[PDB]
Design a protein around this nucleic acid. Sequence first.
DNA 1: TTTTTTTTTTT
Length: 464
Amino acid sequence: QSTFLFHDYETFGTHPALDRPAQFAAIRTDSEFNVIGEPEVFYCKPADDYLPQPGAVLITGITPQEARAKGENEAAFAARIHSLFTVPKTCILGYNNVRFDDEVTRNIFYRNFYDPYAWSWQHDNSRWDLLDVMRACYALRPEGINWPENDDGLPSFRLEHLTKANGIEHSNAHDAMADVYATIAMAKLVKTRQPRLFDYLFTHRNKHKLMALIDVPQMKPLVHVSGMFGAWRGNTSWVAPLAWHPENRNAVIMVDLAGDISPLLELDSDTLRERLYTAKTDLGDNAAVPVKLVHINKCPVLAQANTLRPEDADRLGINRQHCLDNLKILRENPQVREKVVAIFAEAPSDNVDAQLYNGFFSDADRAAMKIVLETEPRNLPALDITFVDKRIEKLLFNYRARNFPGTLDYAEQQRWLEHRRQVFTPEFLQGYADELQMLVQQYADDKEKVALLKALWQYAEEIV
DNA sequence: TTTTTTTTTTT
């Protein structure tokens, strides 16, 4: 039988490729989300070349020390996660996971000699994200479920706010599992209150399932939901697919039909290209370019035209007319599509860890890495295999120097400290201080928080 | 199998 898999991370920072993980959580589930298997949780040892960015530690409450003690080396952290995720017929998911938690999962596998995509592709493996489903469910069919309004009075879509607003427990928040359960809790709330909707979002999660909606030459008007539209509009507005992104066929070029199209008609690409790369403030007394890219491969909420009903669009405030007129004009303008699609025809990182998306690895290397996966820590020095990619030869030096310091050789050991020297440069460390200071000054009142700010400096000493 | 500015989200 096919299964879901609700997972969650706790990291030492936002950026997946640079900031490292700290904790993991996961639960296997059936077609109706009921709890199969043993709840799995590990910790990840932070290597001797990285300092957690305070903000992460303050909100997680998880110090590196704790992780160094409780946790396994990143290789095992990967392996153990890879082994859960490689299970066939699985829909691996979480909250914001596609935007975040999964990326980490990629960079981990990338770092530790694995396929960072296969886990959500090979042997009938898919993925999903409830965050969009919440926004959608509020936007279109909010019957039954509660949604919390903020200070100003706009709907929140935090897990911590949605849980407390739906009876689900979230004492001990930002605790790997506590989320993973409270994450499942919502799926059963959406399959209950609007399975009508749920199955729609679900079945159309896959790439090939989305093309059904996207009619490009004729520009069929679809309903879309992203946080990018913002809470003020209920994260919703109709869109018309102009074209497939020139340099990235995983992206479709859409038009916000709720906005003011005229710029598209009354400017050239090189201005529009400036006007959409213009920020929300310095676009002064003008209109904003109502264009956006929807990425098909990222479980986007795409629905059929009439899905959004007059009962809903009135509740929200989106102006049916404007979107139609604008469509009429867009279909009556076969050159809007000309420049807009030109815009996206203008095309680099230095650190190997962030060098994930430099294409893919050739079948020659795919083997060569899988063979490095066979080699026991002993023989990594010994084995002679040729590599096409320059990224691997680098990755292998780090891989050993973090996960297996015992394997290091007299020279390597001193190259590693010379790396650590280039990493931990005086002023760079000073920053860390200024930050810790400023924060402890900010969070001076609290003792339990400061307790961490202390520990991070303690860590920042001994590690250096 | 893959990636500048919206907006909100997770750590």
